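#struct-pred
JK: can someone run the complex with zinc ion? inputs below
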Amino acid sequence: SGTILIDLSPDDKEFQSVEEEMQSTVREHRDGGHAGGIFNRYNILKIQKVCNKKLWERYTHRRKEVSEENHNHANERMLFHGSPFVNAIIHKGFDERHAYIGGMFGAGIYFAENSSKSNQYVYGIGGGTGCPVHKDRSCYICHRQLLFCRVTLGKSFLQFSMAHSPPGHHSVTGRPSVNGLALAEYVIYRGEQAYPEYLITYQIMRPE
Ligand SMILES: CCOc1ccc(-c2nnc([C@H]3C[C@H](NC(=O)c4ccnc5cccnc45)C3)n2-c2ccccc2Cl)nc1
Ligand SMILES: [Zn+2]
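RT: done, C-alpha cells with the ligand placed:
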C-alpha cells in the first residue's frame, strides 16, 4: 500500500498538539449523546503520523491547482474525520466514490473542527447501530479511531442544512442554523483534497 505509521510518544509535542485539539474541541451535542455517546473527555490511547508518499503527492498536486483557482490561497485546514472506513482511507486515501448520496450537502466527504462531531460518524451516519461488539453508540469499552486531516477547502461555498462543489468553488462549509446545523461542517467532493495525517486511537471517557 506504501503507508507507514509512526507511533508518537505522549511526551512528543506533536502528540500533545493533536491530543489537545482532540480534547479542547469537544462540545455538548443537541441529541444528548444519541449518536456519539455521553462524554466531555477522551482516553487518548495512541496517535500515529500516517506516511504515504503517493497519497501526499496526490494531495499537494491538487492543493497547487486549488491555490491557482483561489488567488494563491489553498484555504488549508486541520480538521477531524469520522467514518467506518478509517483503515481503508490511511492505505488507499479518501475516495468520493464511497460518499453517501443522501447527506445534507450531497455526495461529499465530511470533516469537522469539533472532534465530538466527527466522533458521531465513527460507527456510521448518526452513529449507526453503535460498536460492533455491544451495539452501543455510548460504548466506553470499544476503541474508536478518528483521522486528524490536512484538508484543502479552497473557495468554500457557505450553505445551511448536490454532487460536486458549486461552480467556481472547491468545498462546502455547512453553517449553524436554528432549524439546521449546530456546529460547522466542511465537505469536499474530491478525495485528493484531504490527507489523513494523524490516526487517533481513543475511547470516550465515562463522566464522573
Ligand atoms: C448526516 C451526516 O452525513 C454524513 C456524514 C459523514 C459522511 C461521510 N464522510 N465521509 C464518509 C466516508 C469517507 C469516504 N470513504 C472513503 O474515502 C473510502 C476510501 C477508501 N475505501 C473505502 C472503502 C469503503 C468506504 N469508503 C472508502 C466516505 N462518510 C460516510 C459515507 C458513507 C457512510 C458513512 C460515512 Cl461516515 N457522509 C455523510
Ligand atoms: Zn462496545
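RT: quick notes.
DSSP finds four helices and nine strands in the chain.
The beta strands are 4-7, 42-51, 76-81, 109-112, 144-152, 156-159, 171-174, 185-188, 194-204.
JK: thanks, will look after standup
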